[PDB]
Scaffold this active site. Structure first.
Site, short mmCIF file in Angstrom:
data_model
loop_
_atom_site.label_atom_id
_atom_site.label_comp_id
_atom_site.label_asym_id
_atom_site.label_seq_id
_atom_site.Cartn_x
_atom_site.Cartn_y
_atom_site.Cartn_z
N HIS A 41 0.80 -1.23 0.00
CA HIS A 41 0.00 0.00 0.00
C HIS A 41 0.84 1.29 0.00
O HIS A 41 0.27 2.37 -0.10
CB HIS A 41 -1.08 0.04 1.10
CG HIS A 41 -0.59 0.16 2.52
ND1 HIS A 41 -0.09 1.35 3.01
CD2 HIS A 41 -0.67 -0.73 3.54
CE1 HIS A 41 0.18 1.13 4.29
NE2 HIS A 41 -0.16 -0.10 4.66
N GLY A 136 2.25 6.02 10.49
CA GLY A 136 3.68 5.90 10.20
C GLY A 136 4.28 4.58 10.66
O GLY A 136 5.44 4.28 10.35
N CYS A 138 3.26 1.51 9.75
CA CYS A 138 3.15 0.45 8.74
C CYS A 138 4.52 -0.06 8.31
O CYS A 138 5.46 0.73 8.18
CB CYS A 138 2.33 0.91 7.53
SG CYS A 138 0.61 1.34 7.92
C1 LIG Z 1 -4.09 7.77 10.26
N1 LIG Z 1 -4.47 7.15 11.52
C2 LIG Z 1 -5.13 8.03 12.46
C3 LIG Z 1 -3.87 5.96 11.93
C4 LIG Z 1 -3.68 5.70 13.30
C5 LIG Z 1 -3.10 4.54 13.73
C6 LIG Z 1 -2.66 3.56 12.81
C7 LIG Z 1 -2.05 2.34 13.20
N2 LIG Z 1 -1.63 1.41 12.36
C8 LIG Z 1 -1.80 1.64 11.05
C9 LIG Z 1 -2.39 2.78 10.51
N3 LIG Z 1 -2.60 2.97 9.13
C10 LIG Z 1 -3.60 2.49 8.36
O1 LIG Z 1 -4.48 1.74 8.78
C11 LIG Z 1 -3.58 2.97 6.92
C12 LIG Z 1 -4.34 2.06 5.98
C13 LIG Z 1 -5.59 2.41 5.50
C14 LIG Z 1 -6.30 1.56 4.66
C15 LIG Z 1 -5.76 0.34 4.29
C16 LIG Z 1 -4.51 0.00 4.76
CL1 LIG Z 1 -3.83 -1.55 4.34
C17 LIG Z 1 -3.79 0.84 5.59
C18 LIG Z 1 -2.84 3.79 11.42
C19 LIG Z 1 -3.45 5.00 11.00
#
Ligand SMILES: CN(C)c1ccc2cncc(NC(=O)Cc3cccc(Cl)c3)c2c1
Ligand SMILES: CN(C)c1ccc2cncc(NC(=O)Cc3cccc(Cl)c3)c2c1
Ligand SMILES: [Cl-]
Lengths: 298, 305
Positions: A41, A136, A138
């Site tokens: 991704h 961040g 990931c």
């Molecule tokens: C941006 N946000 C508040 C956070 C907080 C915490 C987060 C913790 N882990 C991962 C994040 N990242 C994702 O889940 C982005 C994503 C979106 C759609 C599909 C995929 Cl495969 C990945 C986090 C993101």
């Protein structure tokens, strides 16, 4: 004496963490030999269509203060493999392993290719992990160490609406019925890892906490009928066999410890704690208990 | 999202762990530059432990009596000295893996990561806190002496603890890296017992602010309290007094969540009176006190859910 949620020493993994940037997205990569592994991704979906439009120089890989040169790219399931022109001199002895729900592992949480923390967790029966990750994170990885070999078992991809986390093995196959895209996805109903609670009760006995022991025993079938009522995973004969060494050490048969667990489920702790906890802990495997109560080194 | 007991990455410390042997005793040492730091009780026998005269035991030793092993390499000891309860062994090779480091003495309530080691080999890493009674609730077996506690805020390792002994209750006692013990303990086999322990109030408050940041507000109430009334209630539950320094330190978390420190103190008072009623806070059924205000800010998001 003492019983802590203990992670493996993270040094061998820290020397593999890099920052991967593609367009506006920055995440973490795992640099082993001449390949950087990261969530696909980072290019964001029709991943083959998005990938065909990219060239090697679109991927910026930074290892510490050094920029690595990407000389090739390919996709394996939900993982992107970036061929680089420099082999990681810090590459440890490693394997890619897929774990089962109930198994535990250490997570090295990273941001911008820089490790920030290490914690221990378990793959839940619903295939999610109750991690601690911010934006961040990931590409952060999960691992176990056996002797001098790092077994990589998890790469972080996303956070579900309940705050729990989802990811893949290092071959890009998701744990659970999840997909790498922004869609209505929810963690299934979770259950308690019964064999791990039993292992933790044996750890409590080894550490001198015996108040929950009783004279009673149970059959495996009667225990499983009770366990099904409290959202506990079924206990198999394999689990009973695996708990054999702890049973021999403490003198408490597995089905005798099951009779203690049954009473704890039906009546609670009555204001008491076990190993400093008021809940039944399920994130220590029988092997984790034996290892922490023996001092195995890496 | 999520809240875990998180340790610092241990790599910078793993590259400093060595095995120190003197006679029949083997324990761990910390190799920084050309010096190996270890507990001075490595020169003792078990008989010596009742009333050891470390100065008398040390004067009888020469450099070649101390065997230091770093991985599969034997280091040569070229000097030795004692500083308080630590032995400093000068070696002929500087550790090429020496990180940027400092020796810091911490106060009760402070947290740190422990790299538990046996025979100079790291086995595990965990997070813990210096209890108000100066002990640590660690996980250590025989051979763990010399294992160290540290923090790594940025790229500098701040060494704050070296493990020396286990008390009769199963808790642990040790020193800073200058050899001064935390607490009224001595490196002697004598009647020593940990004092009555208390809960680290400022840390429980920080953890309640972490729960609010992560989206949980069930425990809040419409009340406030004075600092004095809060302390009168807190002492009855074996909680440490909350000082004005603690209130000041909780300022940023108060500003981020919009809940005044004395308003959060009123929620804590109510939790102590009522218990949790089958509910949990950040996945725990007990009030957690091993996360400092600094740990919460470092781990939690800057945006409140
Ligand atoms: C941006 N946000 C508040 C956070 C907080 C915490 C987060 C913790 N882990 C991962 C994040 N990242 C994702 O889940 C982005 C994503 C979106 C759609 C599909 C995929 Cl495969 C990945 C986090 C993101
Ligand atoms: C021997 N054994 C069962 C354990 C278990 C667990 C242990 C955990 N930490 C340290 C140990 N070592 C000591 O406390 C040796 C000692 C004795 C008297 C005074 C001093 Cl300064 C040091 C442990 C020893
Ligand atoms: Cl401090």
């Amino acid at each position: 004496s003492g019983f802590r949620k203990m992670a493996f020493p993270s040094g061998k993994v820290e020397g593999c963490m890099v920052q991967v940037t593609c367009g506006t997205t920055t995440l973490n990569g795992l640099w082993l030999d001449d390949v950087v592994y990261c969530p696909r991704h980072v290019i964001c979906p029709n991943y083959e269509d998005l990938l065909i439009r990219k060239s090697n120089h679109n991927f910026l890989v930074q290892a510490g203060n050094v920029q690595l040169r990407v000389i090739g790219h390919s996709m394996q399931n939900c993982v992107l493999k970036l061929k680089v022109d420099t082999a990681n001199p810090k590459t440890p002895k490693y394997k890619f392993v897929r774990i089962q729900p109930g198994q535990t592992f250490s997570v090295l949480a990273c941001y911008n290719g820089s490790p920030s923390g290490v914690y221990q967790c378990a793959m839940r029966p619903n295939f999610t992990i109750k991690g601690s990750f911010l934006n961040g994170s990931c590409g952060s990885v999960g691992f176990n160490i056996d002797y001098d070999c790092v077994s990589f078992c998890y790469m972080h991809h996303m956070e579900l609406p309940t705050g729990v986390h989802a990811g893949t093995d290092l071959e890009g196959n998701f744990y659970g019925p999840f997909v790498d895209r922004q869609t209505a996805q929810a963690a299934g109903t979770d259950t308690t890892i019964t064999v791990n609670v039993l292992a933790w009760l044996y750890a409590a006995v080894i550490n001198g906490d015996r108040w929950f022991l009783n004279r009673f025993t149970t059959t495996l079938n009667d225990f499983n009928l009770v366990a099904m009522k409290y959202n506990y995973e079924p206990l198999t004969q394999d689990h009973v066999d695996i708990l054999g060494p702890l049973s021999a050490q403490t003198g408490i048969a597995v089905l005798d410890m099951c009779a203690s667990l049954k009473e704890l489920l039906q009546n609670g702790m009555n204001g008491r704690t076990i190993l400093g906890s008021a809940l039944l802990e399920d994130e220590f495997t029988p092997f984790d208990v034996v290892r922490q109560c023996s001092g195995v080194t890496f």
